[PDB]
């Protein structure tokens, strides 16, 4: 179909966030079987291999930002694989990895489409700046290189000379949203950038929110969506193993609520599963629930809805 | 057919685990569930915990809840299992059989029928070491029997096991080679004998003696002491 | 967690007719338990999934019943190819326990063990150990005590026993005593006593040797 | 500067716990982790537990699970570890030091400097007593060599 | 979990030239790791980090490299106020376990020890007690087996030694061979025997004293 003909993009990438671990990020979702899964419905399912990420050693950091020349390049390398497998009519599954991905993941998508709606699906904002950070982790800045309208507000950080500015501030929606920080307050405020944060998911229920979301997106002109979802805006109930999570978050239910809208647009057209950390869980059990978590939102992506599927034949025979 | 590929015989003191692959193949993965049943020598059989490979479920047993994990590959249908804390009551063989996923679309399954063909696990701490061959063996000779019961006495070896022949393997009647037992100084003895008359003296008989995991040979000719 | 219990522990019956074995549950399996076949050193084969209906390459032979707490398993036209330890397995109940244990032997008119002993090697003296090994060799059924004794006065806990499988042809067992005493131990004492005792013995059959006699 | 004074040398026999108070001081907490690291003598060092001080991450090690338990007082940034059953193996210096904590807003930190000064906790079930004093050193005295070695 | 190993195992280089350490990842840490300097009784300073960066104090001296399996710690000034154990510790998985140990000892020219031996006092001997301890100051390098006897039949199980830190001055080491045995055994026998055996010594030095001889 046109939908779910999928270009799965391994990424094991962790030079963004500190807890290392995130390398099993590729590795671990596709030993759960996710092409496997997905290749009982109707799914194209292509592997493109995961990237090699070479080890720049002379990796000096920025003031506060670290590891800034080995993002730029996984990101550049990334977004030249994903533009190639966009330019073969696919959709970019890329699944890593941590969000500092997302730079190249959705940089090479805007390559072949230019307008782009980003539905970014976080506890965090993830949109400081190299001069508002705290942390300077790059798993908490992608968004900052990727709005225009932050253009002039970001130095040039090496390794980040290719990043073009691609998406606008009124083309990007958040769900999730539970840790914010004040420079991230100040700027998602200042853009006015349309965001759900668990407030507003609380109030409205996760139905209106996803009506309104793609009412906000696609309400004015049919567009190609770009998921980008992270495993620490579910709560960490369902998924415990990854890098940074925050309680109170969206259960699994509206998650699996969240793809299933997406997907009957049938516009998705980029997938992004970042932060999931293997590493991390107390138990292999809790490893087991954030992997069968993360699957299954991937495949409530590509079609597998709830209420069931069938082939479109007769089965009483 | 309907297959499971185990790997490998692997001897751990008792330290870090013996996680052993189960591959399946033939099969479809994804729609039944490995269980792992363990056995000690001389003994019943254990059953030591079952994954789904639908979801996950790990489903341990009593006395182990805690030392044993258990893991899926399903991109390579091989289920693994680990363990913790090993000791050396854990000297089994481990075999892993398909109990079939209890979930809802996955068929009716009860009763075990891939088997894998087992995976020797001896859990101990002794040192890879050559075997001792110290016999006795008239060659025959007398001390009044017409049988010349003979034989050699394998001690001192680790780990299992080795490989007994009488004159490269050509003397085969009266070969009683027997099962192997683990000394308490954790090292292993066997021994092996054959019977022959008291009217062939002209018998050069001679075990061959080989322990690979040592790559070890002792080739023992044998020959009687002075009567009169 | 229920005790599955196998009323014949050993079975030893010859080429010929049933072999009715039994499974006993602790509780109402109802119909859902299994059968196997652990030949010696290999993988346990299935022979009966549910009770009944013979699984999947079974050759004619091997039909059990049930429902719901003492099982039969019926081996209607023997086959010696079958002389292997059979396990009752119940399955809808967690966890998971199996049978016991049903060795079923070969049945031959009971032989008498050949008993044999040996010294150690004086290749063994120049390391310092004496390992004395008695060989009961070719018997039927597997019973045997072997008593060791310093000069007639009884040894323990060095004692080591290798019982063997059944054998193909003759269906007789055989049996090594190992023994492992010291250097110093061994040269304390002259008489070293192999008291044997089987079935066919009326007597118990005591082999010896003296230090440095052969 | 940033310290982290610790309290205190303590014995117990088998035993109830040996509670470690590991007090931060000159660093903002809340906006970091404290770690522990036990070290038996004439031994290397184990990683033992790690609390983030931001919300109360518990995150012990291995053959201990269980045994352990850390709190923190950050009122007065102080950081706890507890123990349970105790024996004779955890005869060590128990030392805690700062990660960082794994959040989103707190900063980068992997590599332990504030250290504390540890904490000497042997774990026996002995009496306090006297020690008892049986040398013999002549005074030198001769029995052939110039230089005379003694003790006590 | 992932060991963490280190080359050299001890090391010994005089004040001067370069000292190059070891740390051998088992995975892939990948620039993640960290250096320490754990002097004896103190607490684990921080030498580097992240592989590199030189953290926050140091002098001049103690860069190091990696990325990201088999790590270097480079002393190229040597500066004999840095002889200290030293320990790698990876960070970035869990859980984090350090290195093994790097004791870099100062290297002179290797000391004889002077093997002295004490009886056990009257004191003692009105308590019930006897400690036989042969002293052996002054040697260098470390290594000493010390052999006790009961009138020339070797002892165990009562022998105790206590080893010291390299002095400041001479570079040299101490040690106590602290044998405890009873009143009873101690007044059975007369020549208690240290056989001290070290580099230096081309023959195992066996300093003696009879019971009551001096």
Redesign the interface.
Known sequence: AKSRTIGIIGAPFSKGQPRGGVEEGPTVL????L???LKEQECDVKDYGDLPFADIPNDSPFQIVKNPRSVGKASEQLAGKVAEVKKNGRISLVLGGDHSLAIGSISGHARVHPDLGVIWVDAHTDINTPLTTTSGNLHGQPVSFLLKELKGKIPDVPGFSWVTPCISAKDIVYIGLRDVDPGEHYILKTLGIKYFSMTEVDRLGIGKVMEETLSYLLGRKKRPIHLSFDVDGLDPSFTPATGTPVVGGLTYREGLYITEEIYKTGLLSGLDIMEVNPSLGKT??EV?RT??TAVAITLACFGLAREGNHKPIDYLN | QVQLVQSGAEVKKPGASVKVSCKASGYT??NYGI?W?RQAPGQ????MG?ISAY??N??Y??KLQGRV?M?????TSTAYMELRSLRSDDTAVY?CAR?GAYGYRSPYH????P????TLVTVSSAKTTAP?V???APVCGD?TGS?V?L?C?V?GYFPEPVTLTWNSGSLSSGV?T????L?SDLYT???S?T?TSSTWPSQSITCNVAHPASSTKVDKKIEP?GPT | ?IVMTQSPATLSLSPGERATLSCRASQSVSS?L?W?QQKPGQ????LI??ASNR??GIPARFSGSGSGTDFTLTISSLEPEDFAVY?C?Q??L????????TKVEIKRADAAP?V?I????S??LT?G?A?V?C?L?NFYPKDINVKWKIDGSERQNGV?????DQDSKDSTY???S?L?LTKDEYERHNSYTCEATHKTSTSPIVKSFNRNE?
């Open positions: 596709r030993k759960a079987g092409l496997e899964k292999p059990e087991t992997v069968n | 993965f994804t269980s049943v019943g059989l254990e059953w079952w979801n996950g790990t489903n047993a009593q994990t893991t899926t590959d399903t991109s075999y109990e009860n009763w075990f029928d088997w894998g063909q087992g001792s110290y016999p006795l001390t049988s019961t034989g006495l001690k009683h027997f099962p192997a037992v000394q003895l066997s021994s004998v019977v002491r | 967690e859902y299994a196997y993988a346990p084969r299935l999934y549910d699984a999947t396990y397995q399955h809808s967690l966890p998971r326990t199996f049978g016991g244990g050949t044999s040996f010294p150690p090697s290749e063994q390391s150990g390992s090994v060989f060799n080591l026993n290798s019982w063997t055989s049996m090594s190992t492992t052969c």
